[PDB]
Amino acid sequence: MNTVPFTSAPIEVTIGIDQYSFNVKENQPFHGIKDIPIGHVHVIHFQHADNSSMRYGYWFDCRMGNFYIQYDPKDGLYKMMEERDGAKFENIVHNFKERQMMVSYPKIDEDDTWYNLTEFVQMDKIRKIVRKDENQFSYVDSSMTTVQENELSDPAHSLNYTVINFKSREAIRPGHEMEDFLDKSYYLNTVMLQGIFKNSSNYFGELQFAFLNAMFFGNYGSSLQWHAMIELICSSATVPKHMLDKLDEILYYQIKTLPEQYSDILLNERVWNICLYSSFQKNSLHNTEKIMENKYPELL
Amino acid sequence: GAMNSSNYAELFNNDIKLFVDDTNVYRVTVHKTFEGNVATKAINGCIFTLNPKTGHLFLKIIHTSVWAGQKRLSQLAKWKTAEEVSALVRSLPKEEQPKQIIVTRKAMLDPLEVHMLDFPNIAIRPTELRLPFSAAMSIDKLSDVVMKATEPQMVLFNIYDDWLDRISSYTAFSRLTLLLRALKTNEESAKMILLSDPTITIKSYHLWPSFTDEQWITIESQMRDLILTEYGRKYNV
Numbered sequence A: 001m002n003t004v005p006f007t008s009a010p011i012e013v014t015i016g017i018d019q020y021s022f023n024v025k026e027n028q029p030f031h032g033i034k035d036i037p038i039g040h041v042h043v044i045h046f047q048h049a050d051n052s053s054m055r056y057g058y059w060f061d062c063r064m065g066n067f068y069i070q071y072d073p074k075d076g077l078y079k080m081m082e083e084r085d086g087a088k089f090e091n092i093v094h095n096f097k098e099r100q101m102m103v104s105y106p107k108i109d110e111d112d113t114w115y116n117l118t119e120f121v122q123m124d125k126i127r128k129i130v131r132k133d134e135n136q137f138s139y140v141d142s143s144m145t146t147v148q149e150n151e152l153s154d155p156a157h158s159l160n161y162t163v164i165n166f167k168s169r170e171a172i173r174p175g176h177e178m179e180d181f182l183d184k185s186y187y188l189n190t191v192m193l194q195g196i197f198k199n200s201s202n203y204f205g206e207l208q209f210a211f212l213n214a215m216f217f218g219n220y221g222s223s224l225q226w227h228a229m230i231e232l233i234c235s236s237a238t239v240p241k242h243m244l245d246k247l248d249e250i251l252y253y254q255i256k257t258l259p260e261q262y263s264d265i266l267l268n269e270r271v272w273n274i275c276l277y278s279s280f281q282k283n284s285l286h287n288t289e290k291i292m293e294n295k296y297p298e299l300l
Numbered sequence B: 001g002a003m004n005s006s007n008y009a010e011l012f013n014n015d016i017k018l019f020v021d022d023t024n025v026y027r028v029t030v031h032k033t034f035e036g037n038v039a040t041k042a043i044n045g046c047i048f049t050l051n052p053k054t055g056h057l058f059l060k061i062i063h064t065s066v067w068a069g070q071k072r073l074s075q076l077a078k079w080k081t082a083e084e085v086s087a088l089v090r091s092l093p094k095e096e097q098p099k100q101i102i103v104t105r106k107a108m109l110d111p112l113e114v115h116m117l118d119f120p121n122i123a124i125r126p127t128e129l130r131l132p133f134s135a136a137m138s139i140d141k142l143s144d145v146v147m148k149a150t151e152p153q154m155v156l157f158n159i160y161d162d163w164l165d166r167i168s169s170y171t172a173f174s175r176l177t178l179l180l181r182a183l184k185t186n187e188e189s190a191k192m193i194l195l196s197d198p199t200i201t202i203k204s205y206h207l208w209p210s211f212t213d214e215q216w217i218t219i220e221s222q223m224r225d226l227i228l229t230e231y232g233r234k235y236n237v
């Protein structure tokens, strides 16, 4: 179990750590988060009390270095940083842990929620989507745009998701216009999976990362991406049985974890009804359809 | 975006454009089978692609053989239309290719947009106008060439005959749409109006009769009355 210590908490802020969150008051004696499960990526995120504009946050993996949070009063935010002095990082952390100034990552032993949401998410792939190579952690916020959003404005601050476009020459073979537009299996299997993603694990990993960004930061571009990657599978007549089964699981836990009160904005009515009720895979997502129908029957 | 009454004059500016109507591509007769079930028999069809400024009509004939062994024919017909229009554009010299294609039905938008991905500068648009191009089969010479075809074939027409020598394209289009609307609302009366007088003939190289300017005013009036007539017969007004 690892630790993300904080130099201080100078401004009131709600702090998220994965699917958990807690309030820290202005100048409260808070010095970080302990007992973070090794083995998974994590995200630590922030919404200032005085200005809920800009949720922002950091994807990281404690195996890849020692990371601490320190407020910057010039840029006005909690910044993640890397300490390369291993010994010195251990002394300060041990002090705060002896003084019980850290909250404990609150994992229930029965609970596989986080694993289920990040099963295919890997820090190395995050860093290709979020370009900032001098850091081992990846900053994201509400307002960052995607490469496709910039095609339809700063390239360094963008989310480099894989562009999916159903009415594109990539998606459509000359001479199979009708076939490829009404059945997207070519685009899914040859272009995206074999061509770009190499395997279904990288594809699912981008999909989960897109969903997490959308739900934790309210990033619209991420939401677009998540819906696009779902629709591309659901709109393909030929999908490996193991992807469909895994997809059903992935979506089920995403829907389970979504705040009920954010459903209105985070869930695309057209995409979901199409996916569950009209598409080639309309009968292949049993778990997802059941939770969707019992939890959000309004949307449908 | 969409085409409607506000931007009507754009049809007659000098940016090449084509209307595409697919209402006659897939045509059937419905009938009873020996066992008392229902069956359709396809008949020849056509795509109606029209330059509204010049009157040039590119009539692609759809021979019933293209449906042989296909399923979901109404859906295939929109994709076949789109394929034929894209083949037409590619066959035209660059300076003759349209800058816009306006489809008369919104279901044609995606099929044409996909077939035309190679032509990103060609704008594919819908229209809010209720145009009567479905009545093109009421034009006897066009109907005749469609039903006689034994193979896929493209026939070129000027649907304004020689009218542009005397009127503008805006007036030629308005005449054409009034004629087609009348033919669509009461084909028999419309044809009677057009051919009642044996002294006015259709030239071999034309589709409509050789009316003088004054006779066209009379014809146009009679067609308005017909549309108004039928409107009253329909709604009991």
Ligand SMILES: NS(=O)(=O)c1ccc(Cl)s1
Pocket (backbone or CB within 6 Å): A005, A006, A007, A068, A069, A082, A083, A085, A088, A089, A090, A092
């Ligand atoms: N980076 S360090 O100087 O070891 C450290 C300072 C404050 C932390 Cl929190 S961690």
Ligand SMILES: NS(=O)(=O)c1ccc(Cl)s1
Pocket (backbone or CB within 6 Å): A214, A215, A217, A218, A219, A220, A223, A265, A266, A267
């Ligand atoms: N702007 S929006 O479509 O409501 C939105 C959807 C998902 C977000 Cl995250 S923000």
